[PDB]
Enzyme design. Structure first.
Site, PDB file in Angstrom:
ATOM      1  CG  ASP A 174       5.817  12.038  13.613  1.00  0.00           C
ATOM      2  OD1 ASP A 174       6.360  13.144  13.398  1.00  0.00           O
ATOM      3  OD2 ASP A 174       6.033  11.033  12.908  1.00  0.00           O
TER       4      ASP A 174
ATOM      5  CG  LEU B  82      -2.164  -1.006   1.067  1.00  0.00           C
ATOM      6  CD1 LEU B  82      -3.171  -0.770   2.186  1.00  0.00           C
ATOM      7  CD2 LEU B  82      -2.857  -0.961  -0.290  1.00  0.00           C
ATOM      8  N   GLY B  83       2.149   1.137   0.049  1.00  0.00           N
ATOM      9  CA  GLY B  83       3.089   2.236  -0.158  1.00  0.00           C
ATOM     10  C   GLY B  83       2.955   3.433   0.763  1.00  0.00           C
ATOM     11  NE  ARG B  84       1.393   6.226   5.848  1.00  0.00           N
ATOM     12  CZ  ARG B  84       1.032   7.176   4.989  1.00  0.00           C
ATOM     13  NH1 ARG B  84       1.178   6.995   3.680  1.00  0.00           N
ATOM     14  NH2 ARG B  84       0.522   8.313   5.437  1.00  0.00           N
ATOM     15  N   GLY B  85       5.049   5.562   1.032  1.00  0.00           N
ATOM     16  CA  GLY B  85       6.079   6.414   0.444  1.00  0.00           C
ATOM     17  C   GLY B  85       7.471   6.004   0.884  1.00  0.00           C
ATOM     18  CE  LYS B  86      11.919   1.620   2.575  1.00  0.00           C
ATOM     19  NZ  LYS B  86      11.338   0.636   3.528  1.00  0.00           N
ATOM     20  CE1 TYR B  87       7.284   7.036   9.283  1.00  0.00           C
ATOM     21  CE2 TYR B  87       8.992   8.490   8.403  1.00  0.00           C
ATOM     22  CZ  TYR B  87       8.249   8.016   9.475  1.00  0.00           C
ATOM     23  OH  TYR B  87       8.470   8.522  10.737  1.00  0.00           O
ATOM     24  CB  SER B  88       6.425   2.128   7.408  1.00  0.00           C
ATOM     25  OG  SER B  88       5.384   3.066   7.186  1.00  0.00           O
TER      26      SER B  88
ATOM     27  CE  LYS C  85       3.158   1.910   9.386  1.00  0.00           C
ATOM     28  NZ  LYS C  85       2.971   3.226  10.061  1.00  0.00           N
TER      29      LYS C  85
HETATM   30 CL   LIG Z   1       0.053   3.729  12.050  1.00  0.00          CL
END
Ligand SMILES: [Cl-]
Ligand SMILES: [Cl-]
Ligand SMILES: [Cl-]
Length: 334
Positions: free
Chosen positions: A155, A44-50, A67
């Site tokens: 955050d 689902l691509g967290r923008g390569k954050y995770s 995740k």
């Molecule tokens: Cl989360």
């Protein structure tokens, strides 16, 4: 020479009035669910954050978001799970469903409720004045609830707000820097993305509280009404305070440095120097004027204060005129 202690203006001892086990994550034994019940569908691509995946929980056929956490300390994994479980059910906070370990990586995985992929980042610069007010109040619901439950998010930024476009369902996510507030506890200043780092973190004032989330939310608001992404654009941790100082002035910064007797580096003091306060009407331009009103400026003004104690609580924020009409939203879905 020493930094004066501080106390939260609201929800000061919520954790104290709760049993130890509610907030003592280092003692929490993690209950595991079956991996063979979840099958990943697509990245689902967290923008390569995770590593975010769509998955089917086969035991009930339902869709879940999975995740897989980047390998951090056992301490910080315990924290988040306990936080999410405690916060489960609350308004606009991601629902944690299961805790699983991957067999081919030995990496912990979190299972979340039905989520449609729309990041607030690629949306919040193109939305109506009404919808800015609408989603801001939705985030506040999450923050008021989680603060009342004794938890700072740490955050708050538009990348960690997820919005179901078609249903207008807003979920605050990314609780990996979240921490239980306890009166008189020193907290890490490394939290929060730079653009959203409060002055307390920037001066190394370590005894901060929930009021951190409210500054960040002020930075998010400033970004939306002025269409300046991000509003405070620091190229450095030191420059971040410079960018803030060039807007709110240095006077009130030195009151804040004095009040809590914070020891700031005399070399950093030189670079900060003297900056005059700027009225927000100077950030107003043709593109954003329709997204700006007196009540927006008033609210923001009461969020972007150096002194954390003088920023609106989440509750006080939900009672601001800026949201007067939007609380009466008629939930039109097309
Ligand atoms: Cl989360
Ligand atoms: Cl404290
Ligand atoms: Cl609050």
């Amino acid at each position: 020479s020493g930094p004066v202690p501080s106390r939260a203006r609201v929800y000061t001892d919520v954790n104290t009035h709760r049993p130890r086990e509610y907030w003592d994550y280092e003692s929490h034994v993690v209950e595991w669910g079956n991996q063979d019940d979840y099958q990943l569908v697509r990245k689902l691509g967290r923008g390569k954050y995770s590593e975010v995946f769509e998955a089917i929980n086969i035991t009930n056929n339902e869709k879940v978001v999975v995740k897989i956490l980047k390998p951090v300390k056992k301490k910080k994994i315990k924290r988040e799970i306990k936080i999410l479980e405690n916060l489960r059910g609350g308004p606009n906070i991601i629902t944690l469903a299961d805790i699983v370990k991957d067999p081919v990586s030995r990496t912990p995985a979190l299972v979340f409720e039905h989520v449609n992929n729309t990041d607030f980042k690629q949306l919040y610069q193109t939305l109506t004045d009404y919808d800015i007010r609408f989603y801001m109040y939705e985030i506040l619901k999450a923050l008021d609830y989680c603060h009342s439950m004794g938890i700072m998010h740490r955050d708050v930024k538009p990348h960690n707000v997820m919005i179901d476009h078609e249903h207008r369902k807003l979920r605050l996510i990314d609780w990996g820097l979240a921490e239980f507030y306890h009166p008189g506890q020193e907290y890490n200043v490394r939290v929060a993305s730079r653009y959203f780092k409060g002055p307390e973190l920037l001066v190394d004032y370590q005894m901060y509280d929930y009021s951190l989330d409210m500054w960040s939310l002020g930075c998010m608001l400033a970004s939306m009404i002025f269409r300046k992404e991000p509003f405070f654009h620091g190229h450095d941790n030191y420059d971040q305070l410079v960018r803030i100082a060039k807007v709110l002035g240095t006077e009130d910064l030195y009151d804040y440095i004095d009040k809590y007797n914070i020891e700031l580096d005399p070399r950093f003091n030189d670079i900060l120097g003297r900056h005059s306060r700027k009225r927000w009407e100077r950030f107003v331009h043709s593109e954003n004027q329709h997204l700006v009103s007196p009540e927006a400026l008033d609210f923001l003004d009461k969020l972007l204060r150096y002194d954390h104690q003088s920023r609106l609580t989440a509750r006080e924020a939900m009672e601001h005129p800026y949201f007067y009409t939007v609380v009466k939203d008629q939930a039109r879905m097309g």
